[PDB]
Amino acid sequence: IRKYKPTTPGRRGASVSDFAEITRSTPEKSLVRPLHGKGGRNAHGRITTRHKGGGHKRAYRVIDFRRHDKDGVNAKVAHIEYDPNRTANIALLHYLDGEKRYIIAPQGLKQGDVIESGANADIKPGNNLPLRNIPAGTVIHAVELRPGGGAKLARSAGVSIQLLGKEGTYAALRMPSGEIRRVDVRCRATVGEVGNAEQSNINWGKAGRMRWKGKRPTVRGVVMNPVDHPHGGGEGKTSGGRHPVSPWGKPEGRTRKPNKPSDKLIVRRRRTG
RNA sequence: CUGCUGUGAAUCUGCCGGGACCACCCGGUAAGCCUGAAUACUUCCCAGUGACCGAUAGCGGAUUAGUACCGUGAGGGAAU
RNA sequence: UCUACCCAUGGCCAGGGUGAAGCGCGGGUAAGACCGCGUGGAGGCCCGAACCCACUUAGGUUGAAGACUGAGGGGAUGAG
RNA sequence: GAGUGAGAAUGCAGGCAUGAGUAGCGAUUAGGCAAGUGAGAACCUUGCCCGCCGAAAGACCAAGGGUUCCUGGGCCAGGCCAGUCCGCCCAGGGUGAGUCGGGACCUAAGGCGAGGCCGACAGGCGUAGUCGAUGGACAACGGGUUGAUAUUCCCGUACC
RNA sequence: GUGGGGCUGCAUGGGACCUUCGUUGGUAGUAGUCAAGCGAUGGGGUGACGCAGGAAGGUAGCCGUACCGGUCAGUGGUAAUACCGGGGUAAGCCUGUAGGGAGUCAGAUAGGUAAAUCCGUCUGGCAUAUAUCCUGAGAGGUGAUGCAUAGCCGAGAGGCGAAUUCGGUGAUCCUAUGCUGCCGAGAAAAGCCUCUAGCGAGGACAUACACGGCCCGUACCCCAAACCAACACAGGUGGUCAGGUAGAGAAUACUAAGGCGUACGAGUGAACUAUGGUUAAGGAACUCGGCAAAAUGCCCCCGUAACUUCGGGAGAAGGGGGACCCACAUGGCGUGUAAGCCUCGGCCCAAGCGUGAGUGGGUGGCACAAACCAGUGAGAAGCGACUGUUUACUAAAAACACAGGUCCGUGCGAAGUCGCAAGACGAUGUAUACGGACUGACGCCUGCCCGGUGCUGGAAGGUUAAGAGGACCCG
RNA sequence: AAUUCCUUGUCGGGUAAGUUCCGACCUGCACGAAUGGCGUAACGACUUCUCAACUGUCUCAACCAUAGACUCGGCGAAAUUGCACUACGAGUAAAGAUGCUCGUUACGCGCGGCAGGACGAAAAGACCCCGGGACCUUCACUACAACUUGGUAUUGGUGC
RNA sequence: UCUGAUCGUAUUGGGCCUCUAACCUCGGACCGUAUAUCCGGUUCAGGGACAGUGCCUGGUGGGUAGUUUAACUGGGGCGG
RNA sequence: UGUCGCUCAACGGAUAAAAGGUACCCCGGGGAUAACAGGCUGAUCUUCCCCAAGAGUCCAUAUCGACGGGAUGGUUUGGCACCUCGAUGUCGGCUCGUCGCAUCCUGGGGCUGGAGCAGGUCCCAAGGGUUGGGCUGUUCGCCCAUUAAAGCGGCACGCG
């Protein structure tokens, strides 16, 4: 966190991430694939996700999330690199082999330090392992849901899963959301808590700083017309005049997995508060 | 009589119809396939006909006519 | 092909102020914290042309124009 | 036997009156004289003055237009007036590339999409591919001529 | 159940018999294999990218000038000591300057879907050199004994045609996709070079000569009477050049190059309307309302209040000087030649050429930012935090949005949405994330109520559909 | 009070005078806490009020110049239109008279100006009522999309 | 055989448990395929008679559609 | 054949089954029907009387005149719906006015509870005059300075 001095009215309550730990300004030519911003529109071209205006263009920087091969092959990080489309800095592994890859870069991962994938890995911050090998209680991330499928949980900034007791074939992983979902064991995970927890203390300061970042203005529901939202016109400031409701009339309740889904693994859901 | 979804048999003392349904009599032989004429129609061509029009009529169009023009476009659409 | 938003790829923004972080020096101290000085040139910063709008007023009001013209007006490195 | 009788439907098509020989004649630059051409001159042709634009009202392109360019001719149509003039009318001519802007080189967004999947049917998506510059790669400059073309023709020197 | 006795059986660590592996002895550096070159449709590098902003080097232009050609512009003065016009020339080819960037050689490895001498990666070695390589504005030479051009001539065409140095100023253009920052993290693919796979007995290079070079666009307009506007329409239209003198400037005033006088005129002091001008005395009395005008306005010094989120407010407010000539001044500053020194070199550098700012003395006017251009200021309240957005064509705001806040949903081909579905967006994202709802920075806060209506959970009761179940009844 | 009808509430300040403005009182018809409450530096072509300077806004208008207007020459429309050698008064009338009544005034035809009337032109009233549409809303009615419940088919063995 | 407690053999339903063979997997690896995150196939690893999709059936359902929403009335509305 | 099932009560009963908004509105109509003006009326309003109970030390009448009665005007709120809905533009202000007298000033007079100056009231009289500001969109009104005075009204609440 670094607070901008309140010089102009848009940098008053602003802050910008230090970006500390970033060894290199530019990503490797070999790994940075390209992705055009889609606009919030599917193949029919219609506004499908709303509020997704064009934002500075980005380049993809392939992280692989599986790392099944070369478990024994040690690695060393070379650089921690900034990534646009994560909420993270991404570490760059050179293997002994010399192939170059990208990791979502946990905390305490200095530049230079030796990590190792595979089954006889030591439990260090940074390295892959199945859930078979990890001692219960340690903080793991990336984990995944289905074996070989690749990392699909705890990928965000400073956000990590705690592995409670595995009991045979299933391991009870208690999510960042406090939800307790039993993955199977032969899935992998990456030991360590994910880096860059300093963000979300960022205020984006001014209005257009969240536009560069790709987000368009959100007209809230009341101001529109009766045609145009359930919270229609009225004559003055309407509260909504009805129970609060998605712009397509769907009630603001539930919306979780429909009944009869494959929720066998979910042994306890998150909480309201 | 016919579609979809379930159930689902019998071959002649069988089976189906005779306006719910049952009994007797009547009729017919399903779950297989073709089948001409009688009938409808007129882009085109021929031969005619008119108590049909005669150039604001008769086709939008007797004259460069779906032309000029109008319109992004579909489309509209003259006059002599 | 107008206009509303979005995607890809280009191009434009005369000129003049202001002086943030960082950096370098000096004071300070135990190091500090901090305080002056230079550098540096940030900003949905400032003044103002192109350019984009259209606030006020006058005209026009069978207009020069089926929405413009003149004097002023706002933005003008950015949500352009 | 009737498409059978109009004065009126803010009725339709053509024609023509009233307003009326009225209002206008489209800027913020401005014209004058001399001489000519001609039946005819405020406007056309030339000279001398005067004024206007000069980050344009100058010079070059894209797009779009279509011969409007040049030469000769014309002045019943048009030009908000007249016209000998014209961006108008007629007839003939004029547009020359290894290097410029493109294609034969390449892809972005996106379009189409073999098969394929989905779909009662029509069709909806999409993989390989294959198109798509507003971008990338690629070899040329200076002068001269025509009544009209010039990095195109020619001259001098180059490069792929 | 309690400890010590057991054989044997199972289980464990270690060396040895065979096997297998390791090692040297003759052969077998021979039967074996690669080695000219084109080298991929394959591999790898490169192509390969953002925004802001100086600083330096240049250069284009421009202004002067040595020098060349010329004029007497019927006036008071000026014969060349004044004035007018010249004072040019490109791509390429040489050199490799300023600037900018780079360690190189060997060995090992299968990581790059097969193979690699390439690319990675790890080891060592010698290196930090103004070395070498790469890139590269510009200067210089050549291109150019040509082409050009001021003028000269007779007379539309022809020919002749001198000098062609030096400074200064200065780009938004070039170096430059460079460099330093910064967060918002900035297309791919052909091309180019290399690597082997594979082709291969021919093939590469140099010099010369002779050749081939395809298709379309090419006129003319192009900020317009030729395009879109029904019109020879006061509107709209993207890019490239960017002269001078003042000026900070592409503002504006005049003006060069070049183009226009653009298509109803002649008049005439009517009223009145439109656009301009000026006004005694008063100065908002006008009026819905200081609307419209008028005023202020530039540069440098002095000066600055409450309040404050400590950044501002602020150019607050208010005030002074500004012209021309001369003196310090042959001074300074910039640039830099010849000479001077040192080791496409560097330093200073008389002169020249340019240019402030200030003190001092004057001079003149009514007026010295003299024209054009060019803030009105202050105090208070309401709403909105702000910069933005909006009803094209009567509403620009207090409305929208916003940064920030809370809640609800969402565990992942998620929720949500578009589609009949597959499929896609969300997102090549993973609860510090996405979606929805409200509020709208900041500061201090956000009280009570779950009865109604919703939402979330719970099945103990009542009440409830199809499906099974066919008593009794009827034909 | 962007909410307060009564209400120009009452008191205080500014003004010579203040239905607007600023501070306060509380009897809030009918403020009130994320449809947020109260504040608030900076910011506003926002709304309201006061002042300084300055002015034709005014007291109270004047003069000058352009472009129209006016005159002569050229081309030359338009909306409107039952007529026509289309006076005024007091009346009368579908209740506001150029046309009817009784009187009064007034030669014929133009031109430049001003706008009282022609219930002036334009737009088959935007208000109001009747009829019909539209679109929007909801505990109006009736359906449907979508979501969800159970059966049964796809669809089976095993044990309790 | 009865007023009724009961097993064992079939049928017939309800519930739960697990299994794998239907089916499902946007979970992997190979093949079509030189190219290919589509699709198809083989196999592994999982779910698993559940889900999904038919047919039947009850709910919620301004999300959406079609329409109704009286007349008298000293103009309508409110009242009656 | 006999009877039964409907606040079908909007009771001759449009369906077994149905509520609102529109200032975002639209279309067909209507002066059958409202708004603004005009017209009839005159409840109300305004001006003026008739009677005289009383107040006025006495005295009804100098001046007020209750309780009652009768009218004028057509200016207030109206009542009616006759003109106009195939269009009669609204309040204020400004500019320009013209008329009435039921006179605010000036002029002439009668009576006084008129000593004088100044008043009151009535009668005659419309020639001219009848201010400028503050607040309000304001008409009205309050106010501040004056004045001889700061008139009342009509004319589509005169005049777009």
Numbering used by the authors: 3 to 275
What does the paper say about this structure?
Ribosomes are the protein synthesis machineries of the cell, which translate genetic codes on mRNA into protein in all living species. Here, we have used single particle cryo-EM reconstruction to determine the endogenous structures of M. smegmatis (Ms) 70S ribosome in the hibernating state, trans-translating state, and P-tRNA bound P/P state. Ms ribosome shares the conserved ribosomal architecture with Ec ribosome. With a conserved core structure of ribosome, mycobacterial ribosome exhibits various unique extensions in its rRNAs and r-proteins.
The large subunit (LSU) has 35 r-proteins and two rRNA molecules, 23S rRNA, and 5S rRNA. Compared to Ec, Ms LSU has one additional protein bL37 located near the peptidyl transferase center (PTC). The rRNA extensions of the Ms LSU are the most striking features of the mycobacterial ribosome. Ms H15 (A272–U318) is extended by 36 nt in comparison to Tth H15 (absent from Ec). A 23 nt long insertion at position U748 in Ms H31 results in a new helix H31a. This insertion is present at the base of the central protuberance and extends to interact with bL27. H54a is highly flexible and the observed density is fragmented near the tip of the helix in the P/P state 70S ribosome.
